[PDB]
């Protein structure tokens, strides 16, 4: 069902937002480790901590892209559903209009209408 897909997409996005928060924390942690290494005079290990920070930032970007893709999919589904709702309302409205336009069991107005239409249109060819 559309509802099923929608709730699952939201659940997935929620989890990815938690992964986002976790990765941001890990990025700050790498910065922290780098500063401490520099205060120790170990530029090699500071650089190594910042290389890892860069890798984590790359993964954070991929998490963000995954979330965006799911949000777009969710929007598409919600939009399609509203379109279906409009379509069903229009078809039931059209049914009601047909019933009203055949509302006369008395007497032969529709056929006369069509006859006069064609007379009026006869000037066109």
Author numbering: 18 to 142
Provide the publication's sentences verbatim.
By selectively removing its autoinhibitory C-terminus, we determine the first crystal structure of the Snf7 core domain in the active conformation at 1.6 Å resolution. Surprisingly, rather than adopting a rigid four-helix coiled-coil, the core domain undergoes a large-scale conformational rearrangement to extend into a highly elongated structure. This conformational change not only extends a cationic membrane-binding surface, but also exposes hydrophobic and electrostatic protein interacting surfaces for polymerization. Comparison of our Snf7core crystal structures we determined revealed two distinct conformations. Although both structures exhibit an open conformation, we noted two different orientations of α4 with respect to the α1/2 hairpin. In open conformation A, α4 extends in the protofilament plane, whereas in open conformation B, α4 is positioned perpendicular to the protofilament plane. Superimposing the two conformations revealed that α4 can rotate by at least ~90° along the axis of the α2/3 helix. Despite the large differences in α4 positioning, α4 makes a similar interaction with the α1/2 hairpin of a Snf7 protomer in a neighboring protofilament in both structures. This supports a model in which the assembly of the extended α2/3 helix upon Snf7 activation results in two key events: (1) α4 can no longer bind in cis to its own protomer; (2) α5 is displaced from the α1/2 hairpin.
